[PDB]
Amino acid sequence: MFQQLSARLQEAIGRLRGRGRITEEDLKATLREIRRALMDADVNLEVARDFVERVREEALGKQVLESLTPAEVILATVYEALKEALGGEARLPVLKDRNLWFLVGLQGSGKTTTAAKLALYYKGKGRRPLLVAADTQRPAAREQLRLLGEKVGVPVLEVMDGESPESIRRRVEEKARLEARDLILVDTAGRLQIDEPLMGELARLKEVLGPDEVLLVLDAMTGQEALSVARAFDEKVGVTGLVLTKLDGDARGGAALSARHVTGKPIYFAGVSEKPEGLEPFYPERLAGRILGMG
Ligand SMILES: Nc1nc2c(ncn2[C@@H]2O[C@H](COP(=O)(O)OP(=O)(O)NP(=O)(O)O)[C@@H](O)[C@H]2O)c(=O)[nH]1
Ligand SMILES: [Ca+2]
């Protein structure tokens, strides 16, 4: 991911090197190509437009038309714009003595696998997590998490078919108290598409369990479609943060570049592989540099 956009941006900027001062026409042409590169990377249209306008403002604010090294000013301005579009500053969920987080998303988003990856990540951080398979309709879905969780050395509590939210709360609360778990991760039911029934169940489970965080897992490869899912989930359930999976997937990187603008939700973690340790915090600044070939 980002490979296509990265090459287009690096080319647009590099082609200005060693040519002395550039004309306003050169700047406009450059800004247009950047906007086009973003658009072709499935970046939201409004975001792409706002992006080039910000770079334009900041570039002129640095007298790019006067600079003898315009390529450097453009790189510096695009870098800041990329960093901000990607989230600005790295963000992570606030940890308290006791925490209960919800993992929501569609089937195939990597939600379940991410739930297990998240448990391992915080386990290595000194936390004592407890995984909860909350799909009261799909036993096989619950078994998938138990296997994934126990494999990483994390306990997993499976809900029973048709079990009520109140019953789930009780059992989870007990197991957490007995095993002294400080981080409860609830893996909610995942379906191929958004269906009112499931959304209602999620909303209800949220009311009874009262999670302090609701992480929405999204397949970054779905591009802008992911932002549509985010809106639906936020409007019907209420999310606090996002997790973009398959960032290593061969696809455009428009989702990550539009998330902040479109959803207003921070991207906490990123999925970079299938392996259990294929999850790491999302670093806006670091990603911005990688896209511009800064290493
Ligand atoms: N390459 C790669 N694959 C990932 C990543 N995250 C998840 N996957 C893959 O996505 C596939 C689906 O996983 P997942 O969505 O958890 O399972 P599911 O059977 O769709 N159920 P659910 O969607 O409810 O979690 C798996 O093959 C998993 O390895 C990632 O960051 N990178
Ligand atoms: Ca708008």
Specify whether 243 is located in the same domain as 156. Answer: yes
Q: Is the CB of 289 under 6 A from ligand 1?
A: no
Specify whether 105 is located in the same domain as 185. Answer: yes
Neighbours of 168 (CB within 10 A): 20
Specify whether 49 is located in the same domain as 174. Answer: no
Q: Is the CB of 272 under 6 A from ligand 1?
A: yes
Q: Is the CB of 222 under 6 A from ligand 1?
A: no
Atom of ligand 1 at shortest range from CA of 249: 1
Specify whether 22 is located in the same domain as 112. Answer: no
Specify whether 104 is located in the same domain as 76. Answer: no
| Resolution rounded to one decimal, in angstroms | 1.9
Q: Is the CB of 240 under 6 A from ligand 1?
A: no
Which tokens in the block code for residue 78?
């695009």
Specify whether 77 is located in the same domain as 40. Answer: yes
Distance linking the first and last C-alpha atoms of the chain: 16
Instruction: Return binding residues for GTP.
Output: 105-112, 187-191, 245-248
Max Cα-Cα span within the chain: 71
Ligand (nearest to CA of 218): 1
**Smallest Cα–Cα separation from 202: which of 102, 53, 93, 125?**
102
Distance in angstroms (rounded) separating the CA atoms of residues 236 and 216 = 12
Asked if 149 and 155 count as a contact pair (C-beta separation under 8 A), the reply is yes
* Residue 291 lies inside a defined structural domain of this protein: no
Best residue for ligand 1 mutational test, from 142, 218, 274, 275 (most atoms within 8 Å of Cβ): 274
Which tokens in the block code for residue 110?
């990597």
Specify whether 108 is located in the same domain as 28. Answer: no
Q: Is the CB of 271 under 6 A from ligand 1?
A: yes
The last residue of a domain, from among 60, 75, 90? 90
Radius of gyration (C-alpha) of the chain in whole angstroms: 22
Sheet holding 156-158, edge to edge: 156-158, 129-133, 183-187, 99-104, 213-219, 241-245, 267-271, 279-281
Neighbours of 96 (CB within 10 A): 10
Q: What is the 3-state secondary structure (H, E, C) of the chain?
A: CCHHHHHHHHHHHHCCCCCCCCCHHHHHHHHHHHHHHHHHCCCCHHHHHHHHHHHHHHHHCCCCCCCCCHHHHHHHHHHHHHHHHCCCCCCCCCCCCCEEEEEECCCCCCHHHHHHHHHHHHHCCCCCEEEEECCCCCHHHHHHHHHHHHHCCCCEEECCCCCCHHHHHHHHHHHHHHCCCCEEEEECCCCCCCCHHHHHHHHHHHHHHCCCEEEEEEEHHHCCHHHHHHHHHHHHCCCCEEEEECCCCCCCCHHHHHHHHHHCCCEEEEECCCCCCCEEECCHHHHHHHHCCCC
Neighbours of 235 (CB within 10 A): 10
Host domain of residue 207: 91-281
The last residue of a domain, from among 44, 63, 90? 90
Specify whether 85 is located in the same domain as 95. Answer: no
Domain holding 120: CATH number?
3.40.50.300
Specify whether 195 is located in the same domain as 160. Answer: yes
Distance in angstroms (rounded) separating the CA atoms of residues 208 and 185 = 15
Please, which experimental method was used? X-ray
Specify whether 140 is located in the same domain as 10. Answer: no
* Residue 289 lies inside a defined structural domain of this protein: no
Specify whether 96 is located in the same domain as 80. Answer: no
* Residue 197 lies inside a defined structural domain of this protein: yes
Ligand (nearest to CA of 47): 2
Which tokens in the block code for residue 190?
């995942």
Ligand 1 centre to CA of 152 (Å) is 16
Ligand 1 centre to CA of 30 (Å) is 38
Residue nearest to atom 26 of ligand 1 (CA): 110
Indicate the number of domains in the chain.
2
Atom of ligand 1 at shortest range from CA of 272: 31
CA distances from 137 to 102, 143, 195 (A): 17, 12, 14
Specify whether 125 is located in the same domain as 271. Answer: yes
